[PDB]
């Protein structure tokens, strides 16, 4: 139910905000992606 971020390696949903640094629970690997949009995108099929 709802997510905000993700880890490059240990692909695990996070969810944060200012103050709590930008790392992850377990492995540091301080990267993190930003998981898709909720409002699905549509495509021409040509």
């Amino acid at each position: 139910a709802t997510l905000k971020y993700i880890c490059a390696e240990c692909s695990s949903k996070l969810s944060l905000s200012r103050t709590d640094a930008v790392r992850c629970k377990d492995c540091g690997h301080r990267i993190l992606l930003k998981a898709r949009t909720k409002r699905l995108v549509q495509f021409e099929a040509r």
Binding site: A21, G28, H29, R30, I31
Partner: protein, 37 residues
Amino acid sequence: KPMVNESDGVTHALYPQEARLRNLTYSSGLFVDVKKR
């Protein structure tokens, strides 16, 4: 061997892939045995 000495953190063993993303420099330590006399 290559490593990231970031503050508010220890010292991660840096791998290219990360330096690329994080804009870091895949470099390492230069140590020399000085003599005090």
